[PDB]
Design a binder for this molecule. Sequence first.
Ligand SMILES: Cc1ccc(O)c(S)c1
Ligand SMILES: [Zn+2]
Length: 257
Amino acid sequence: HWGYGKHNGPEHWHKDFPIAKGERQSPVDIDTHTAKYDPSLKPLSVSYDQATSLRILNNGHAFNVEFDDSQDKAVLKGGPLDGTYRLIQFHFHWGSLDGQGSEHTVDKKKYAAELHLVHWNTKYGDFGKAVQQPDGLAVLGIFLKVGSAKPGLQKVVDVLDSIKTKGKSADFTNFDPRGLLPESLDYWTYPGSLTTPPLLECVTWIVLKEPISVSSEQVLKFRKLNFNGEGEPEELMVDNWRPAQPLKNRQIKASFK
Ligand SMILES: Cc1ccc(O)c(S)c1
Ligand SMILES: [Zn+2]
């Protein structure tokens, strides 16, 4: 099945998921000079004060920090969005080397990793019905660069050794995703897709301009995770990013001058 290696990586995914060569695939390169400022974008509203994390899971492709999305807590609205989108999980994509890892790129620059905070449009009732709709998801994408540590990330880094391999989970309560956000909410936005199979075209992407800084030791610990299950040959969970896809008939809009 699918993954990130030579035989089952991004160049292969189209055979099981033909939408891989669709009209609104993600990620894309963000050409900052041609992304036009849109003064009709309303400001972005991230309301994470009542977020309830539950668990962290190694799914064999990344790790997910999962949230209780059974009530009106942890919502994203405003910006380009009509309505309210509820946080369900976040995960990262990262590299084997600090010079690569992000899925979106900014004027072809690759960051060391990228955070995806995944939210579903509450008008569709749950995640599974929302990924059947073209406006079902909003993903807040945040770039990571290597420099100073991100103190708000440490509780995640410290739990990773308990979920080394595919299928492992760990209780992960009371984690506050506000500690993963940069100062500014200036962003670029465009219509796209999941960047992993099943590659569904449901996503309004909101990619923050300001990266967060994480330390070299924090990212090194992401790179000790494993794609394989326990008892299987070790394959380090690194380079779980899809490269940029054709922009096709899309415009990227900037929230800022
Ligand atoms: C499950 C899932 C939801 C949203 C996403 O952007 C990605 S990459 C994966
Ligand atoms: Zn992702």
